[PDB]
Amino acid sequence: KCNTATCATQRLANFLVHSSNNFGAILSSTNVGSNTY
Secondary structure (H helix, E strand, C coil): CCCCCCHHHHHHHHHHHCCCHHHHHHHHCCCCCCCCC
16 A cells, blocks of 8 residues: 555656546546445
């Protein structure tokens, strides 16, 4: 998981290179949905 740590670099970088995640995030709802449900 890694909430607040060096991992941030990996996660962010992944979201930067995978712009698609911006849209797919609504299909998976793992980063936007899981945040609550």
